[PDB]
Symmetry: D5
Subunit: 104 residues, 10 copies
């Protein structure tokens, strides 16, 4: 969580990750965006990256994961707008989950 | 499947098979479902089995889309649902969209 | 014309064809695409293909074609909204034409 | 300028041309689109090709060109809306210019 | 600051620069964009290129960098709309930053 | 069949056509390339277009077509090497057929 | 097994199927290819489609699956060259398997 | 012609041009590409551009052009290997021509 | 390490990973292929995936990593041919390393 | 940098800047170096600094490639080296390859 006096309008951060599918205990690979308007504070990449690795080994639906991480983004830097998107692929099906908070 | 805090949107996408009524030929297609959850989440497996339900079935692309909307509405009643079907037949690319509800 | 008891919200059809350029009398390849909102009836793909094949050997500008084909789709399934897009390429020029009728009711 | 009965709603034309860069007198290669709402008339492709081609040998900024070609298309076929876009590259820089006139 | 009689509606310029990561002192690679509504004069490509080169060997975050460059464009040419986009990739994370100002 | 002085080393021609599928009497859309080493003669594009177009309405397998068009091109312009490739899609299946004659 | 008088030089057919992962009992999604030099007869698309559908709800590894299908093609049509390619994505890992036989 | 004290191993140049189709007398847009091995001298880009601009308004088949341009590059920098590739599009047909001379010594 | 009686001709496995750049202690994201002809045994994905995660937290050059993992592939399944490719990106530079063993 | 067991091949790639002699215009380019290590590895930073050496410098693309080959040969003497330079000038795409040695 990094200070900056003069703040930008929007920030997208995007990376890959790993969780577990609770139905069958298999590792699940996925992709995560986080889009946010800062006010004063700016999420650090190292931090965002730690936040994403928190789901290694852990059983969770991709729809939970997206919300879970939204709540964490608000924990650390509490911004008005935050969208989180989790793109994955399971059993021949491509999945995306957007979890949103605030207005554009 | 149920969530405490629902995500704002979900897109599922995959491939399936129907039969072309006119010609009784197998029709391969791709299909997306975009919905706003209210309480319930559609298990991926149940989505798959909805999509596999059309194997062997004679149906227009136009009807397949609409039939799948109903199904998804029935299974989890989202306030907004959009189903998209894409296929190719006799050199013609085909999309069909079936929406119900408010964004 | 194919009768459907539940009209889907939108349908796009898309395919290649050809015509003749009236200026130079050469064959003009194109993509065409019809996007429409059904009310009751659906355009059979076979009929759409027949509409597009109708332009083979026909002398006509692409701007004319988008509009000719629009009229056809109206006469056939009379939908409340129709958009025809023609895409082509002549003498180093990429060309798009769009023709529309009605609105998203 | 060829006269159709019913006008289409929208026409885009796109092609490549060249000009000279004022600063350095080297040739500039560019891509140019014109998008326009017809009224009675439609611009012949041959005529558009001649419009773009007239800039060969001519020293002009990408910015002035977008405007110059737009003024030509209004004068030729008088549409209620015209958008010209010029895309080019110069000394490691991707450049796009738009010039519009009238109502969407 | 090249004067033009008739301004275009919108200009985008895009290119690559470097700077330095504060945390780790590592040379940072990035893609950068300025979209702006010119008022009276356009930004010379050469000038813009200079602006972006100016950050070579400088300690700045991708979030601050975007903001600074927005300031510079407003000085140089004074447009009523300016958007700056920065794109990068640090430590397995893709990063975008947008910095806006005014109405379109 | 147009006669050049010095022959090129290699010509590819590629276009779209249609046929009927024997099994089901529906139309098959395909992409077809012919690659050939010229000797004195070069196949006119108009003549090639007519070759591909003659299959409209004709029931034939993609496989037999590749061969049939190859026999036509040898008969028209008699190259020491010809490769025809036919690409198509049918009931969820991507299909490619090659038919070659002679020496690379 | 469709007979043809003059065989083509090479045929590729490509499509999607499913099977089941042994370890985890999860429905496995995959892309599959057969390239073959036909001798006397070609494989009907329909037949091939059948071959690949045959694995729905079967316990097999992506490595065995490739091999089995190679066997089947050799039975059905008996070509002197056959290559089968399988492609997948299990648990964040992209997987290709090739299974050859004979000379080209 | 630009003299170079150390010849690189290969150079490709690639650009767009136009010509005229002798059949229909329309303008034909194309990509062209020259690949060569220098021995001593390098083709200036400005001269390459001049060679390609030489075909504007000129009636000529693309097969003829690949070969015409090949001869030019030979006359200019006389390299031990040259490959000219022309790419074009006429009446729904994608076209490639290749012309070669010499080998990888 | 999985048995299969009848073995395939080739297998590519490809995934992403994380190591450390020893020069500056920053996490390094990368991509890894492994291409191999099996004999009898077949590397399991779970295993390959564990082998790739072994480099989390660890300081190593990308040129070491590729060789290191080659040696590990031979540890577990000892095949004639093995290629390993590691694509990464550091300080504005795109890097690939192929580490090979045996013949094609 | 030195390796015990050398990798069989290495590709480095990045962007740089020179000056066009004819026109004194800045020339942006992309450049790859593919080499077979023998003992020594080229540090990425040293590669970068080789590529940055051409800023401000008037040089043909043809010569830049060849100059960079020499440099790489000098720094680490690989038995096979291939340098590739790509640029755009007056509407013409340019590649130059400079190889030395055996694959
Ligand atoms: C595994 N992660 C998994 C299995 N089935 C799922 N269904 C839905 N809807 N979301 C998931 O994350 C699922
Ligand atoms: C076969 N699926 C088929 C054949 N003709 C069709 N026409 C329309 N409109 N829709 C289809 O799904 C068709
Ligand atoms: C040939 N198709 C042709 C030639 N010139 C044209 N100009 C316009 N505007 N539209 C066309 O279809 C043209
Ligand atoms: C040459 N065309 C050139 C050189 N520098 C330029 N800067 C701007 N803004 N526009 C141009 O067209 C330029
Ligand atoms: C390095 N430039 C760097 C390292 N971590 C960063 N985090 C954020 N938020 N922004 C940066 O520019 C960073
Ligand atoms: C129709 N063209 C058709 C249907 N099934 C086919 N199988 C094969 N091998 N080839 C074809 O051209 C086929
Ligand atoms: C599931 N199908 C699965 C899980 N792990 C695998 N490992 C290998 N080598 N092959 C597979 O098909 C695997
Ligand atoms: C016009 N460029 C033209 C028309 N027909 C052609 N046929 C062949 N073979 N080559 C051409 O350049 C042609
Ligand atoms: C960091 N991992 C790093 C820094 N510099 C490097 N140079 C080379 N050649 N390889 C690496 O993996 C490097
Ligand atoms: C500028 N970099 C420039 C101008 N003309 C050139 N010609 C050749 N052959 N190579 C270059 O790098 C050139
Ligand atoms: Na443009
Ligand atoms: Na083809």
């Amino acid at each position: 969580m990094l200070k900056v006096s003069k703040s930008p309008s929007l920030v997208r951060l995007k990376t890959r990750g790993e969780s577990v599918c609770p139905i069958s205990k298999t590792v699940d690979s996925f992709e995560v965006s986080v889009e946010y308007i800062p006010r004063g504070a700016v999420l650090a990449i190292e931090e965002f990256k730690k936040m994403v690795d928190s789901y290694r080994g852990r059983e969770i639906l991709h729809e939970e994961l997206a919300v879970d991480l939204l709540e964490k983004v608000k924990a650390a830097v509490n911004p008005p707008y935050v969208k989180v998107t989790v793109k994955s692929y399971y059993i021949g099906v491509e999945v995306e989950v957007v979890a949103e908070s605030g207005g554009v």
